[PDB]
A paper describes a structure:
All FZDs contain a highly conserved cysteine-rich domain (CRD) followed by a flexible linker varying in length in different FZDs and a compact hinge domain before the transmembrane domain4. Here we report the cryo-electron microscopy (cryo-EM) structures for FZD1, FZD3 and [name], including three structures in G protein-coupled and active states, and three structures in G protein-free and inactive states. In the absence of agonist and signaling proteins, these receptors are trapped in an inactive conformation owing to the rigid attachment of BRIL to TM5 and TM6. Together with inactive-to-active conformational comparison on each receptor, sequence conservation analysis and functional assessment, these structures reveal three FZD family-conserved molecular features (W7.55/R6.32 molecular switch, P6.43 kink and the W3.43–Y6.40 interaction) that may constitute the structural basis of the activation mechanism of FZDs distinct from SMO and other GPCR classes.
According to the results, we found that all the three FZDs exhibited constitutive activity in G protein recruitment, in which FZD1 has a constitutive Gq activity, while both FZD3 and [name] have constitutive Gs activities. The structures of FZD1-Gq, FZD3-Gs and [name]-Gs complexes were finally determined at a global resolution of 3.6 Å, 3.5 Å and 3.4 Å, respectively, by cryo-EM single particle analysis. FZD3 and [name] also contain the HD and TM domains but lack the H8. Structural comparison of FZD1-Gq, FZD3-Gs and [name]-Gs with active and inactive SMO (PDB: 6OT025 and 4JKV26, respectively) reveals an outward movement of TM6 in these three new FZD-G protein complexes relative to inactive SMO. Such a movement of TM6 was also observed in the FZD7-Gs (PDB: 7EVW18) previously, suggesting that these three FZD-G protein complexes (FZD1-Gq, FZD3-Gs and [name]-Gs) are all in active states. The overall G protein engagements of FZD3/6 are similar, which are mainly mediated by the hydrophobic interactions, polar interactions, and hydrogen bonds between αH5 of Gαs and TM5, TM6 and ICL3 of the receptor.
Residue numbers in the entry:
A (entry chain A): 2 to 59, 204 to 253, 264 to 394
B (entry chain B): 4 to 340
C (entry chain N): 24 to 149
D (entry chain C): 30 to 86
E (entry chain R): 157 to 262, 268 to 495
């Protein structure tokens, strides 16, 4: 009787293990199809103004954003319930496929510490594979700020005087060349460290946006498609 | 405020002078008449598959049979280490977790992470299905290591530079331990359940008592953040692993740093430190996709355990000291003997 | 214990070049890289400069470019900040900090007065 | 740093200095040696065990 | 009158096979198309081919025992394909070593085996035909895995758990059709090499049972490999639209194309050999009866205005070419 009972409970344990393994394999397909995003930025960077019509669907440690584009679900994190030190919980985000790094291009100090944070994220050992989708928020505020004339770009960056607008740069219609020069100077200031330590593996996707633009989801979709295609090409030892 | 600086300096050099006076002889020359530990490298007896994301934490419990594994997918999987069969696969509210605990009894399991909340579940319930038992909240930082001492009160280490001891039934905080200035990343309990030690990002391990909220002792001697901590099986010594590629064995009674395990070919950080049952072998997980076992007497590299594709995250030894479980970021648990 | 004693600065006449010194004990100075951070009254912590392990890679902020210099000697295990003249907008307290990983090039050394591996600092005014 | 923070630090230092209870390093090392040699026979990692004896074969 | 059965070509039982609409008529045991030393030369020739073909595929026979991993689900079918044609070439060699004496159904009473009245055609025939069809279907499995991995990019490391599904097709589709050939007695014995293979001395065989499944497998394999190349070329057409340059993509396309062509058009020539041998045999027998009705004392066909004869070079290239589809994987482990 005891042997029969022990065989029965062994069979029941095996059946339960098979059932939960089947459940895990079923959840695996749903897990590895929705792309995860980690969003970083300052308090004044415009953290929640990226996506507005999917901002409200109808805890405070992590704020979540579910939004679906072209039958692909995007699962967006922002971490604000912790302290200022971030060298320990940023290792929890190794497997995230994209870091949406939002930069306030109006208030400056601020841009220098954002640049240093970008250096720290890019050169991190456990974030050395993650691509960064870089958003240049508050472009309109920069547009009137650089035409105001009260704030000089040269004071906070001495290298702006010996800079010119790139020929590959395509200026938007309806603006003077100097705001385009300022925007692409900020973009080149980020790209000089974006393209200095990364020997392949990961590159950046600079984009310009404001509080009015409602096409950021399309840009994130295209960037994630490029990221997954590049990861697939790299994993097949295709240099 | 020059008198405060003078008092701090005089107390610091008094501590240094007392430590030097009590350091009559180093223990490196003490362990000279004993035989060296042979090459006792072990092989992977079983490998546990099933996790879909990286494994961060792990625990054993009193019986050396039921593993707990926490993954960033949002899964707490309880494994039968003998026959390799999963028993429960608890889903979690917050996917980002960094700690898990198994009670001395088999009834309760715990977890926590970036949600700043410690969630505990029953296992042996009347209905037969796992569910959220209790939700301990009140930390304003991420949880790094929670450890059970009984079935009614728990001790948790958080990134808010403060540790806490909670009671389960009322859900409140019994005691709060403050005095660290950096993120507390590890927490180990003494076998007698009277003292514990917490290692922080201050290159400091502070030893606390559970009955009082005061700090019993403080230990310095590292250069970077402490990631792991573990008492000796005796209970009068402990080992700390840090990011400076050095392990450091301290003793409780002398308040002195005793032994520095380091090598010139290692630069990677140390993520998980666990003792053996006899306290001779010291198992330390490193960031070079490997683990190293040393001895606590000659401070020599006894052996190397390899076979992980990503960084190690958790390392554990059973209470009877038979199996050693290593959980790294390639979603695999390796059992060694 | 790892500590970073600081000296120099304070009542400095303009037009003279001074050398703010940081003496490090504890950690081996060669294996790590170091930063200079400043805090103005009414303002938060602001990163000023950084120097790598070998001293080849030196970086500054925009407001100090071309005037301040930073250097270090590993044999003496000391670090120096050479300052020429002064600025009217540099009245601040200066900290010399170290990011807590030896063989990396990424650091997180700006906090709300909560960081560990940071000296007491010297206050300089004009 | 802050005056209150330094006051808390110094009162903590004098509180931990109030109860010294410090011993010699040599006797602590001897106690460590004694505990290591007393439980050396029962350790299942330093000494390999037969496959029939342990359930981790 | 028409064609009548010769007296020396009468069978010993009701095998169920009709020879030009006449029951109990069988072709003779000798091939009698390679007179004098020629057949022996042919034998020697194919012997060298055997000692060539094995000596190639052994290079990809030992490539599996080196490691279990680093053989992805797209690369899963190639090792089975290589080993399957390795043992096809090996058993062809040992069938050559067996001898042509115990192949046909043993004064001029010697004739080839027609059906399940055999003694040694049984296991040899299942092994040869089932394994050749299994190798072709395994190459088709390679093509469909390539299409699933480059036209849709599924996982390349986790779809392997579906392999045991495709095995049930890959080992099952030939296994479905390897039973009928021996069921209603449609198994014949080769006398040039010493082989008992289907489709030599009849028209119904090598029409719906040998040629058409092989042709449809090649057609679907080529279509899906072209689809995979088109998909990867679209992926590359995404490239060069920005400030980047890629050169490994050319190397991978060239390597996939040469690996495809080293098996595709060889077996296309094999189908050409089958079609030529099938359309001409039905009148080759009429040419034979016209030429040798005086020797056989059977009625001569009245209008044999087109004399035809099999050629040496085509049979030489056929007996070479059949076991050349097995060396393609040898280029992959090169």
């Amino acid at each position: 009787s005891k042997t029969e009972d022990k065989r029965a409970q062994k069979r029941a344990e095996k059946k339960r293990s098979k059932l939960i393994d089947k459940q895990l394999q079923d959840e695996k397909m749903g897990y590895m199809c929705t792309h995860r995003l980690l969003l970083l930025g300052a308090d004044n960077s415009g953290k929640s103004t990226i996506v507005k019509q999917m901002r409200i669907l109808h805890t405070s440690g992590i704020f979540e954003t579910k939004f679906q584009v072209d039958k692909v679900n995007f699962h967006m994190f922002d971490v604000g319930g912790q302290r200022d030190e971030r060298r320990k919980w940023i290792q929890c985000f190794n497997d995230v496929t994209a870091i949406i790094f939002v930069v306030d291009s109006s208030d400056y100090n601020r841009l220098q510490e954002a640049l240093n944070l970008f250096k720290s994220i890019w050169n991190n050992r456990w974030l050395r594979t993650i691509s960064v989708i870089l958003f240049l928020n508050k472009q309109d505020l920069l547009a009137e700020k650089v035409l105001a004339g009260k704030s000089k770009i040269e004071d906070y960056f001495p290298e702006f005087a010996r800079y010119t607008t790139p020929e590959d740069a395509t200026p938007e219609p309806g603006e003077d060349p100097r705001v385009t020069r300022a925007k692409y100077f900020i973009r080149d200031e980020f790209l000089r460290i974006s393209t200095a330590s990364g020997d392949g593996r990961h590159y950046c996707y600079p984009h310009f946006t404001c509080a009015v633009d409602t096409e950021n989801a399309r840009r994130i979709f295209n960037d994630c498609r490029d990221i997954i295609q590049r990861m697939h090409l790299r994993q097949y030892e295709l240099l | 405020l020059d008198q405060l600086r003078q008092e701090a300096e005089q107390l610091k050099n008094q501590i240094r002078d007392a430590r030097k006076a009590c350091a009559d002889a180093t223990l490196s020359q003490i362990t000279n008449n004993i035989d060296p530990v042979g090459r006792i490298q072990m092989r992977t007896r079983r490998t546990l598959r099933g996790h879909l994301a990286k494994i961060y934490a792990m625990h054993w419990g009193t019986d050396s049979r039921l593993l707990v594994s926490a993954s960033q997918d949002g899964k707490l999987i309880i494994w039968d280490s003998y026959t390799t069969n999963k028993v429960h696969a608890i889903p979690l509210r917050s996917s980002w977790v960094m700690t898990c605990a198994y009670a001395p009894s088999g009834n309760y399991v715990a977890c926590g992470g970036l949600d700043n909340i410690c969630s505990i579940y029953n296992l042996k319930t009347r209905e037969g299905n796992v569910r959220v038992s209790r939700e301990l909240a009140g930390h304003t930082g991420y949880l790094s290591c929670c450890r059970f001492l009984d079935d009614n009160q728990i001790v948790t280490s958080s990134g808010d530079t403060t540790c806490a001891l909670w009671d389960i039934e009322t859900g409140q905080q019994t005691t709060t331990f403050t005095g660290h200035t950096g993120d507390v990343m590890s927490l180990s309990l003494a076998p007698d359940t009277r003292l514990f030690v917490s290692g922080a990002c201050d290159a400091s391990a502070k030893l606390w008592d559970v009955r009082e909220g005061m700090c019993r002792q403080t230990f310095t001697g590292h250069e970077s953040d402490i990631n792991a901590i573990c008492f000796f099986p005796n209970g009068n010594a402990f080992a700390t692993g840090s990011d400076d590629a050095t392990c450091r064995l301290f003793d409780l009674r002398a308040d002195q740093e005793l032994m520095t395990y380091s090598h010139d070919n290692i630069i990677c950080g140390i993520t998980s430190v666990s003792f053996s049952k006899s306290g001779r072998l010291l198992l330390a997980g490193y960031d070079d996709f490997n683990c190293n076992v040393w001895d606590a007497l000659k401070a020599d590299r006894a052996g190397v355990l390899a076979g992980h594709d990503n960084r190690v995250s958790c390392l554990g030894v059973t209470d009877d000291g038979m199996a050693v479980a290593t959980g790294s970021w390639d979603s695999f648990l390796k059992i060694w003997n | 214990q790892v500590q970073l004693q600081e000296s120099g600065g304070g009542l400095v006449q303009p037009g003279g070049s001074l050398r703010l010194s940081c003496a490090a004990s504890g950690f081996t100075f060669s294996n790590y890289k170091m930063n200079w951070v400043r805090q103005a009254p009414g303002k938060g912590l602001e990163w000023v400069s950084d120097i790598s392990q070998s001293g080849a890679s030196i970086s500054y902020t925009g407001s100090v470019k071309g005037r301040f210099t930073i250097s270090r000697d590993n044999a003496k295990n000391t670090l120096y900040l050479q300052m020429n003249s002064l600025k009217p907008e540099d009245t601040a307290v200066y900290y010399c900090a170290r990011c807590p990983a030896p063989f990396t090039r990424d650091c997180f050394d700006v906090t709300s007065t909560t960081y560990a591996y940071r000296g007491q600092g010297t206050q300089v005014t004009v | 740093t802050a005056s209150i923070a330094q006051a808390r630090k110094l009162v903590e230092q004098l509180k931990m200095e109030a109860n010294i209870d410090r011993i010699k390093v040599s006797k602590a090392a001897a106690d460590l040696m004694a505990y290591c040699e007393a439980h050396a026979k029962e350790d299942p990692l330093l000494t390999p065990v037969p496959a029939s004896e342990n359930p981790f074969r | 009158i028409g064609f009548w059965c010769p007296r020396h070509l009468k069978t010993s039982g009701g095998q169920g096979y009709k020879f030009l609409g006449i029951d109990q008529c069988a072709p003779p045991c000798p091939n009698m198309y390679f007179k004098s030393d020629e057949l022996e030369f042919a034998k020697s020739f194919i012997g060298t081919v055997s000692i060539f073909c094995l000596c190639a595929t052994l290079f990809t026979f030992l490539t599996f025992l080196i490691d279990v991993r680093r053989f992805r689900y797209p690369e899963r079918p190639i090792i089975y394909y290589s080993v399957c044609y390795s043992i096809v070439s090996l058993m062809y060699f040992i069938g050559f070593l067996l001898g042509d004496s115990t192949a046909c159904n043993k004064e001029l009473g010697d004739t080839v085996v027609l059906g399940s009245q055999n003694k040694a055609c049984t296991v040899l025939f299942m092994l040869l035909y089932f394994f050749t069809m299994a190798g072709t279907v395994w190459w088709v499995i390679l093509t469909i895995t390539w299409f699933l991995a480059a036209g849709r990019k599924w996982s390349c490391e986790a779809i392997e758990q579906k392999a045991v599904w495709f095995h049930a097709v890959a080992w099952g589709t030939p296994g479905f059709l390897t039973v009928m050939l021996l069921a209603m007695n449609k198994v014949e014995g080769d006398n040039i090499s010493g082989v008992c293979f289907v489709g030599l001395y009849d028209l119904d065989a090598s029409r719906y049972f040998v040629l058409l499944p092989l042709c449809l497998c090649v057609f679907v394999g080529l279509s899906l490999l072209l689809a995979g190349i088109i998909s990867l070329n679209h992926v590359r057409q995404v490239i060069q639209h920005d400030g980047r340059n890629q050169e490994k993509l050319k190397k991978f396309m060239i390597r996939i194309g040469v690996f495809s062509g080293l098996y595709l058009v060889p077996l296309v020539t094999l189908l050409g050999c089958y079609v030529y041998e099938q359309v001409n045999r039905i009148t080759w027998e009429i040419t034979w009866v016209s030429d040798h009705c005086r020797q056989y004392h059977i009625p001569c066909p009245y209008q044999a205005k087109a004399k035809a004869r099999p050629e040496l070079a085509l049979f030489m290239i056929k007996y070479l070419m059949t076991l050349i589809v097995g060396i393609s994987a040898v280029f992959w482990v090169g």
